Amino acid sequence: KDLQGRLYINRVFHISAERMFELLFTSSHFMQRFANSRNIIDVVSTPWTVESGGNQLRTMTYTIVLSNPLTGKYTAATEKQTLYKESREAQFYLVDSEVLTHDVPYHDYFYTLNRYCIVRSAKQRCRLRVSTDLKYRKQPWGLIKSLIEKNSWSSLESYFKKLESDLLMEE
Ligand SMILES: O=C1[C@H](CC[C@H](O)c2ccc(F)cc2)[C@@H](c2ccc(O)cc2)N1c1ccc(F)cc1
Numbered sequence: 678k679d680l681q682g683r684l685y686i687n688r689v690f691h692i693s694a695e696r697m698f699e700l701l702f703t704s705s706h707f708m709q710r711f712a713n714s715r716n717i718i719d720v721v722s723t724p725w726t727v728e729s730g731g732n733q734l735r736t737m738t739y740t741i742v743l744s745n746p747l748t749g750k751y752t753a754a755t756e757k758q759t760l761y762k763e764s765r766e767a768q769f770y771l772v773d774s775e776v777l778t779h780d781v782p783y784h785d786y787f788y789t790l791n792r793y794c795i796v797r798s799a800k801q802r803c804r805l806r807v808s809t810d811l812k813y814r815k816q817p818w819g820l821i822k823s824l825i826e827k828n829s830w831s832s833l834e835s836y837f838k839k840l841e842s843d844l845l846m847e848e
């Protein structure tokens with residue numbers, strides 16, 4: 678069930694699956710601190726809502742303060758998060774997060790699909806797996822694809838390394 682693009686986190690935490698979900702997918706103190714650390718500002722979120730089909734939905738908007746000047750100073754972003762009912766019936770959590778940016782060069786060419794899988798382990802532990810696909814909306818001819826990929830893979834590498842490290846402090 679991993680996405681084939683890249684596997685960024687695959688780690689067993691001394692955190693229960695439900696508390697993992699709470700830390701990452703609610704307006705938790707953890708995500709307030711993490712947002713500050715990552716220079717993510719002006720966060721607006723919904724709660725989780727429940728669809729007739731049983732999946733749950735959550736959306737967010739926020740601004741990213743960017744570090745590479747060629748990507749701009751800031752970009753607005755929108756996220757759509759889906760929690761799959763089938764995963765919950767199987768006693769785990771599978772969330773697909775789709776992330777779109779609005780201001781970076783070539784913003785209209787791509788979006789990011791991040792898949793978060795939280796599986797129960799003995800003794801109030803869980804395994805968190807996070808994998809990512811870069812998805813194209815327009816054909817990224819030539820240097821376009823090279824620049825999108827180089828910038829994205831490096832930024833996400835940093836982001837998820839810090840997420841894993843900061844989650845360890847919540848054990
Ligand atoms: O994936 C992800 C990151 C998720 C963000 C997270 O959902 C969060 C955290 C705290 C909040 F309060 C609110 C939302 C985000 C990202 C943001 C900043 C970064 O320096 C790197 C990646 N991104 C991304 C993906 C594609 C892209 F084109 C630009 C950014």
Ligand SMILES: [Cl-]
Nearest residue numbers: 765767768769
């Ligand atoms: Cl469960």
